Amino acid sequence: LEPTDQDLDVLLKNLGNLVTPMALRVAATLRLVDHLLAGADTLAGLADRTDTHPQALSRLVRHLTVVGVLEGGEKGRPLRPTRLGMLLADGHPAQQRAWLDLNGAVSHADLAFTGLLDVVRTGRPAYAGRYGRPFWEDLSADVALADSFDALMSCDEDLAYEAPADAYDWSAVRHVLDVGGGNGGMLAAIALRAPHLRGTLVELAGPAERARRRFADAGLADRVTVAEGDFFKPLPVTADVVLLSFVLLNWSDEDALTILRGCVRALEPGGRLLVLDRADRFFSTLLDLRMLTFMGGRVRTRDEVVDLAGSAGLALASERTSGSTTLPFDFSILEFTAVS
Numbered sequence: 001l002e003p004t005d006q007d008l009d010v011l012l013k014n015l016g017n018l019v020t021p022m023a024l025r026v027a028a029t030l031r032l033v034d035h036l037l038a039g040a041d042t043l044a045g046l047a048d049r050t051d052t053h054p055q056a057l058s059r060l061v062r063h064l065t066v067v068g069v070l071e072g073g074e075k076g077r078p079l080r081p082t083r084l085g086m087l088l089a090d091g092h093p094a095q096q097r098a099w100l101d102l103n104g105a106v107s108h109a110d111l112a113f114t115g116l117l118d119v120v121r122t123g124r125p126a127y128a129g130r131y132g133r134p135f136w137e138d139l140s141a142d143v144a145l146a147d148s149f150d151a152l153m154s155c156d157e158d159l160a161y162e163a164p165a166d167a168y169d170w171s172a173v174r175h176v177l178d179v180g181g182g183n184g185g186m187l188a189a190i191a192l193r194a195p196h197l198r199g200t201l202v203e204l205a206g207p208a209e210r211a212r213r214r215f216a217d218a219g220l221a222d223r224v225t226v227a228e229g230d231f232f233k234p235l236p237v238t239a240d241v242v243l244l245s246f247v248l249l250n251w252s253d254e255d256a257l258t259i260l261r262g263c264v265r266a267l268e269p270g271g272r273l274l275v276l277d278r279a280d281r282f283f284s285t286l287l288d289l290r291m292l293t294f295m296g297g298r299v300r301t302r303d304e305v306v307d308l309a310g311s312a313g314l315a316l317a318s319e320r321t322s323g324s325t326t327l328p329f330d331f332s333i334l335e336f337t338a339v340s
């Protein structure tokens, strides 16, 4: 095959273009579009409001103009965002300004993509190599990253867990061990549906503190407790139900296996281990690479989790996938028993 000039152009402006996406991130981070919409319409004006180097900013601004994010400033027209540029306004529902915000977790993490070669070579995430510690430990210690990461996820919404909680019968369930339960959304929805149910959530300090508050707010502290812990170490209690809610997808096959082995060990005899997890092609592969690059994990298909569970001494007992009005993706609950 012989590449056309159009192929070359698309490679240079788009696919191989690492400059423009950083310009967008700098643009979002500086609230450039917001400052323009609030009245700034000159370079010195924007520079003054962003505390940026006037000449350097003009250069970012020329680029942003060529690529279609800003317009005007014809060297006597007024500097302004384009229709596309309006995506960076603070309140657009697509939250693109938050996604690109270098202060935010996702964009911050995206920068670790400069270590992608090593990621493809070793299968290991680049995040720690860039920032000093692994993704979740970083988010745990830094509330701005944690909250910013959470704010962009549908799981963080008010009714996020109603449907999955609705999908399983908790009536006879006595004690749920919620491994890496985050701020406790699933556990709370469960505890509310099952008044006699007790719960134990194991988490890093950051999310543990937020889960404590969620449980208190809900009148659940009497029966749902929070334990700060490392789910790579032996779990602190046993339970007739062990829950992994959107946890496995964050880990490599190897790390996910060590987590499950840990869960099987805390699972009381006869108990149930539950894994709740789960154009078009572009977005899944994007997500997949972020997951790999950020934390060493991946979205696994059903069978893949089944085989992984099988290697942890678990056998599939039942499976259910369903949709929600809240989530942009259907969810699924894999229910396992100890095969021994």
Ligand SMILES: C[S@@+](CC[C@H](N)C(=O)[O-])C[C@H]1O[C@@H](n2cnc3c(N)ncnc32)[C@H](O)[C@@H]1O
Pocket (backbone or CB within 6 Å): 136, 140, 155, 179, 180, 181, 182, 183, 185, 186, 202, 203, 204, 207, 229, 230, 231, 232, 244, 245, 246, 247, 250
């Ligand atoms: C997808 S997030 C939250 C998952 C949550 N159960 C839910 O329903 O969304 C994954 C969680 O695993 C937690 N985590 C990561 N490493 C951990 C570890 N070593 N010990 C405990 N929790 C950990 C993170 O703090 C994060 O809250």
